[PDB]
Amino acid sequence: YTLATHTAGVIPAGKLERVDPTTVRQEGPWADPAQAVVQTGPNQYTVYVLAFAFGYQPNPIEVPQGAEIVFKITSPDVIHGFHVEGTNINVEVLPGEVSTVRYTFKRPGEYRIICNQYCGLGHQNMFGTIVVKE
Amino acid sequence: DGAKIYAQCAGCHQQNGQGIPGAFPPLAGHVAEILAKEGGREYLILVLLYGLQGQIEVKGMKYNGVMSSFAQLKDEEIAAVLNHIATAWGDAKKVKGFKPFTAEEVKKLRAKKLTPQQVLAERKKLGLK
Numbered sequence A: 001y002t003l004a005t006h007t008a009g010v011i012p013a014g015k016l017e018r019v020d021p022t023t024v025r026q027e028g029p030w031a032d033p034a035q036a037v038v039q040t041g042p043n044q045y046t047v048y049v050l051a052f053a054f055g056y057q058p059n060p061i062e063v064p065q066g067a068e069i070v071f072k073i074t075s076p077d078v079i080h081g082f083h084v085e086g087t088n089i090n091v092e093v094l095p096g097e098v099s100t101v102r103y104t105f106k107r108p109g110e111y112r113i114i115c116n117q118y119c120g121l122g123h124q125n126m127f128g129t130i131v132v133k134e
Numbered sequence B: 001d002g003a004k005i006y007a008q009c010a011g012c013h014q015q016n017g018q019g020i021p022g023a024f025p026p027l028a029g030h031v032a033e034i035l036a037k038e039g040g041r042e043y044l045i046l047v048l049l050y051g052l053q054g055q056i057e058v059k060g061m062k063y064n065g066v067m068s069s070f071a072q073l074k075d076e077e078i079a080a081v082l083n084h085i086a087t088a089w090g091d092a093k094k095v096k097g098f099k100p101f102t103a104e105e106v107k108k109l110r111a112k113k114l115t116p117q118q119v120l121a122e123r124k125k126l127g128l129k
């Protein structure tokens, strides 16, 4: 039933989006926390999220509710995870791999991202901040 | 040099040295605060080599992140960025007799394998919440 609805957006894209995790933080859509949110259609906004060492860029991830947000998260170092507490977003973030997930926030508030995937001694404190605008 | 490594600091603390509220603490007008403490300079190196991880409260603002363990960088590089940031904002000019970070101080700490989770205690021991 999930594949027969827009709920399938919470599932990572089937298309491969491999890039260079070394310069992805210096050159590219993940090299600027300002132009991270780019409109890609009617009420559709693509947000590039860079998941580096114990951090997430941009932060806090401010996005509008009632719109289709195309989250494109990638890692420039080790493996990470994009599990937003309070949502259905649970996708793995690999190094140099752009995990694309389409979400639609129907409720505002502050959400914390839980990085399930290991990463150093402070992997448990790797909590990103998401703020959906009402 | 210090500028080359500064590019890495900009990834979280930005080029403004303000950071992100609730994620990354500020450096401008904060390094001097630590440099004035007994062992504050050592902490600055430890927080770079290994890091820190908790919910520190700077100026009443609490965060929830982790310092990046720049152990992959050379001792000279680690000291270079420290000297660069301290002189960049001029925080090193707000202390009496600022001693430039030397690779020697980095080496002595690099030999002592610690964890960012343990550094949290060391930081709080200095009175830093």
Ligand code: HEC
Pocket (backbone or CB within 6 Å): A052, A053, A054, A055, B005, B006, B008, B009, B010, B011, B012, B013, B023, B024, B025, B027, B044, B047, B048, B052, B053, B054, B055, B056, B058, B063, B064, B065, B066, B067, B068, B070, B081, B082, B085, B123
């Ligand atoms: C994200 C990948 C970071 C990068 C890159 C750098 N720092 Fe950082 N730093 C980060 C966090 C999340 C924190 C706070 C940890 C927490 O528990 O919330 C810090 C902290 C510091 C501090 C200490 C501040 C304090 O004790 O009040 C310093 C001095 C510091 N960071 C320095 C620093 C330098 C020089 C960097 C480039 C070499 C650098 N940081 C990068 C996250 C990140």
Ligand code: CUA
Pocket (backbone or CB within 6 Å): A054, A079, A080, A081, A115, A116, A117, A118, A119, A123, A124, A126
């Ligand atoms: Cu990044 Cu766990």
